[PDB]
Amino acid sequence: TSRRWFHPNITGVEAENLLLTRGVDGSFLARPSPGDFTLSVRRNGAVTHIKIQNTGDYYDLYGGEKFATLAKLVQYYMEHHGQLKEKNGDVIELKYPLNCADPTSERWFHGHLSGKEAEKLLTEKGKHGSFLVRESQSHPGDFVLSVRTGDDKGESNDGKSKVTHVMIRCQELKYDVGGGERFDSLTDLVEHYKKNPMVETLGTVLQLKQPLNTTRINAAEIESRVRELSKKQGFWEEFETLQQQECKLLYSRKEGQRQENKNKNRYKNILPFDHTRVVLHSDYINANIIMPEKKSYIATQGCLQNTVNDFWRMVFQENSRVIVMTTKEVERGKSKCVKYWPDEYALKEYGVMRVRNVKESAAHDYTLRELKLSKVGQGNTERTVWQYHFRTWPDHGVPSDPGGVLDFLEEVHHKQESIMDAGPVVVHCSAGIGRTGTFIVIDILIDIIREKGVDCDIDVPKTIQMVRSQRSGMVQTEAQYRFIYMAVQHYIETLQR
């Protein structure tokens, strides 16, 4: 569970060179291509490149299956759960992950950074255990590990906290700390000294507890940050650093893997976490609760014809009053969601549930439907559910401008507020992770902003990671990540005007 097999800055020829020179039959590595990826596997003394497409909904292993994360794909195939057979029939077997040495995707690596800058950052934002690695300014080629140790966090003036700088020599492509073991990369060195902290001569234990947070920003300055991330790419490096931490979120999904529930998932290997699974009071639905660390969400898949009734049971049980569909019924020739709502003015029964379609309202980017949900046998249980069906989301990538999405979310939020103590807001697309995660993260950040104003801190990676711990693969592509950033920027600018 390390994910050292993903090389962010490698190309096809370099991957072939690595697999043949420093590898053996069974060695594999994943690499990024424009939005797609490649799994290069050594077999029979040669290399085979399998394409992995991710347009925004899921990872598509050509000749394989759909996955919410590259980590889960590699796990699925290494552990023999599935066999990556080729069109010929011969099995392509993953065996030995060829570890990468590039640290640009590590949370704690800040190349362009001086000693005084790093010490100032640690004094300001770091606490006990906060650490970072930087390039040595006095020794070109070597590095420096700056670690803080003390009692409290912040720029204290009592001598209880302090910053220590440990030199890291890079000799013959191997990293050491002036003596002892020589590690194959900065990552191995950092992990070793995380497990086995250094002890100073007088007792001080240099604990590498958490990396120094460099992503939390004040909203007012997002503009600058965006430019700082636009000058490889800033957005790309930050999103890849976020992806690197996906192997720490492979939680249990046994309920979705049950044989009774197989037919209730649109995609086989995209399942809900057990600890945030939506339980029905026939208890299974591919849905998860998303709770920001007041308004909660339900992230779920597009309805299957055999799950519409369970979907409406969920909406009723959870007392949800707002639904957000971010996909049309068919995309690029494939079906992504079954029509689960009645035609305008019509009334339809889904199992024990009943749904009237009172009125519809066609907007530029979306359609609003005022449905009335009730339970057959008791009319007192009639309630109004407002379905906001977004229709102008491109089949590939993300919108070019976030204004439509922002007004959409603003209306959704006002509607959710109009109903007192309303249940979670249901949000779904196809697999319920890509567009769903993007919309939910944007809604969370914009709610923070609207409540606390411009004078507040926002952390996009932290929010996305908190949401990913509740459903696998929330926010799928770097395009959606940059779109989140740009939508926050646009909302800040509109509020400032």
Ligand SMILES: CC1(N)CCN(c2cnc(-c3cccc(Cl)c3Cl)c(N)n2)CC1
């Ligand atoms: C310059 C650099 N090499 C790439 C950007 N940078 C960072 C920092 N922190 C995060 C972060 C923040 C909160 C949660 C999670 Cl999970 C993550 Cl990963 C991040 N994604 N990138 C630092 C190193």
